Design a protein around this ligand. Structure first.
Ligand SMILES: [Zn+2]
Ligand SMILES: [Zn+2]
Lengths: 457, 457
């Protein structure tokens, strides 16, 4: 078990430290609750619980959570909800140009990544791809990578208008394109149970669904606008057991083949014992041989220089993540980490500060009526994850708003409260048992904006 | 307080030991639960509860019963259900030719006893009558001794066919008959409250109901078959306070008089100070004087030699039980033992291994729809017995199947699950509060067959 020459050691250590700290903050709540349940409800109950909470979780608890526990029993569910919300707040607060130039040199003025809403793909940008979130990098996760065409088209139009009017990334005459990346996931160890649940854990079904959505988006962009407007499409598959990516190389015209791809597992295997420059040569030629391969991978021409450079950089970055997983877990995630191990249900736009693998179940929705199935899937997952142990389900309803648009924050807060009430009236049996805990938050759309808590009522 | 010369001392000691052990196994659960309720739900709750259970009940508990008790509170109801099921299993496991010859010498090839479903009559065979359960001795208990004519006729036909084809008890030409015994019960101390609840605690009502059912069965056998096919009928009353039987002596033609009977209390009183052979002479003549008495006991002729010998043996056997009660409780059962003191509700065919007085409430039924009133009576009894103390009601659904018939075991298991679900949907308020605990079991119809637990779902 040696180290790859291209591994980013200090970045790996930093990422591991952040992951460990956040997961520990979320996980230490349960032992504290178990200790609390053994404290008699005497006259010293409140003081003892408060000092124990200060010693364990680093914060105290509101007296309303403990004031009437002597007559109403231990308020373990309320303490759990409060502690989970505090852990999420602490994680976000603790988290809180070169990428644009690199994208421009590769021939793109904007990169749009649409991975699956699976929790195992949450850390796709900071861990698997090592791509920072910039003003021109977007991450819109959907269930089964089934991203919506209309909003992507609107984003494309907005970016093109910005290029035409101000040329913020670059002037409109530059021959750069809009890059849309679709990410599917699969499990090598358990293909039939640990795959994409949106497609019945069928690897090829997820692959073809993502490819079809990419093709539909490209054709919609072509149809909606004239003068030969077009976009570039990229397809990436992630093995959730080893966090290794296979990138489907487009041909000269940009079409993607489900069989023409570069797999980073064999690349890591065959570049382990070489030297940095030689490994870079290896991946540079390997992209070419994969793109020029025949048979089922028959492709017309070869991909552009920018495409190949971008894919090579992606593979080099993913090598560090493969090495990170090998170091931390001996080459494969533990059996508990292979499946669902989420700590809370994220509803709305999600958090850009806690992009950690298998931390939360994300349900991209603006209305419960439109995407109820995501909420039901999350509740079903947490029924086994949490309700089996008797713990309540924590739900963070987070939304982003644009401060430039007048009245946007109030509308966003109203939307958050509406979502909270809709999730309340559904699963009303779980509500009556206090098995659902909520926290509502809003944030400005700018990167690094503070997160503001809002009252549930 | 001296001992009757005909008392079976070692048999009495053995029976008392078994009764004490079984009742202690069932009764020691509650103090253990009360001790458990005082254990704080700390980190040592599971270990302490398990070691206490091992020390007290002789067995441990599944972790699922205690794993989430810290957040859901003490699972006293679940532990109660599990411990009661384990006690029943232990009692059955601990329990697990001459009689046929004696029956044949008395002129019967099969004996069928149909006592009331009252719990105080549960130990009628091993204690009150000292009659072992053989391949030709049957015990079908019904509420109010209201045994069903059709199944008795079917059993008679099966036995007669076996005699004709193989002659297993004896050849068909032998002048033996099928003996049907009906047992009613009454209370001397509290006639109006501790009598047969199926007849409003009216002694004469129970007597005439049992006599009418016996007459109906005899006439049905006579009508259904020609060549003068007939059966012998016997009527027995049991005083639940002293476990003493009065046997109604049939006349020469087999008819029974509600007033012509031999009472074993006066027999025990008048045979206490004599010697064995003299006491046997006394009961032999006493049968004759009772059968030859006039007035309201006017009967045509005298009973046969086999009938009188059988009745004399029954009285001699019941003398030992009278002596047993006198020894253990000073001549009468304690006031708590006079009424209802059952530990669980037996539904189905009952257990032949725990035939102990006042141990369980038995509800002979194959469908809740047909005999719902028995279930309601049992639930009403246990509402005062158990629900007053806050304990749940334990219910053992036990059924017997014939392994010779293909597919019988699966059908029996399906029937048990159907009965369990039907009892669940009724009394749904008790179900939601976890006040009903169930255990489902099946057993082969052969005597001594193992009891197999089945899953509730
Ligand atoms: Zn998925
Ligand atoms: Zn009765």
């Amino acid at each position: 078990t040696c180290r790859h020459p291209l591994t980013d050691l200090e970045a790996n250590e930093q990422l591991g430290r952040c992951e460990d700290s956040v997961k520990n903050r979320f996980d230490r709540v349960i032992p504290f609750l178990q200790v609390v349940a053994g404290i008699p409800l005497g006259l010293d109950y409140v003081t003892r619980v408060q000092e124990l909470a200060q010693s364990s979780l680093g914060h105290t608890l509101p007296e309303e959570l403990l004031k009437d526990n002597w007559i109403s029993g231990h308020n373990l569910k309320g303490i759990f909800g409060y502690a989970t919300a505090k852990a999420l707040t602490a994680a976000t607060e603790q988290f809180s140009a070169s990428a644009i130039g690199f994208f421009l040199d590769c021939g793109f003025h904007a990169v749009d990544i649409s991975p699956c809403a699976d929790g195992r793909l949450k850390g796709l940008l900071p861990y698997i791809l090592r791509l920072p979130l910039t003003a021109f990098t977007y991450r819109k996760a959907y269930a089964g990578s089934m991203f919506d065409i209309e909003d992507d088209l609107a984003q494309w139009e907005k970016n093109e208008l910005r290029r035409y009017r101000e040329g913020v990334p670059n002037t409109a005459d530059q021959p750069t394109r809009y890059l849309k990346i679709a990410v599917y996931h699969f499990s090598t160890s358990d293909p039939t149970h640990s795959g994409c649940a949106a497609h019945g854990s069928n690897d090829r079904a997820a692959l073809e669904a993502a490819l079809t959505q990419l093709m539909k988006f490209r054709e919609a962009v072509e149809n909606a606008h004239c003068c030969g407007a077009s976009i570039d499409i990229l397809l990436i598959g992630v093995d959730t057991d080893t966090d290794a990516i296979r990138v489907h190389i487009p041909d000269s015209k940009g079409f993607l083949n489900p069989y023409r791809y570069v797999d980073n597992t064999v690349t890591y295997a065959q570049t382990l014992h070489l030297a940095p420059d030689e490994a870079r040569v290896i991946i540079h030629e390997a992209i070419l041989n994969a793109n020029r391969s025949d048979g089922w991978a028959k492709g017309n021409g070869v991909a552009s220089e920018g495409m190949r450079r971008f894919i090579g950089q992606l593979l080099i970055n993913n090598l560090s993540q493969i090495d990170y997983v090998v170091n931390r877990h001996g080459g494969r995630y533990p059996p508990n980490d292979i499946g669902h191990a989420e700590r809370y249900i994220s509803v709305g736009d999600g958090f850009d500060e806690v992009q950690i693998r298998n931390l939360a179940y994300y349900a991209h929705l603006d209305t419960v009526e439109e995407n109820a199935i995501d909420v039901d899937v999350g509740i079903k997952i947490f029924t086994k994850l949490n309700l089996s142990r008797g713990l309540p389900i924590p739900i963070a309803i987070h939304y982003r708003y644009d401060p430039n648009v007048p009245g946007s924050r109030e509308r966003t807060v109203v939307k958050a409260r509406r979502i909270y009430n809709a999730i309340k009236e559904r699963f009303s049996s779980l509500d009556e048992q206090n098995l659902l805990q909520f926290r509502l938050s809003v944030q400005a759309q700018d990167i690094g904006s503070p997160i503001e808590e809002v009252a549930s009522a």
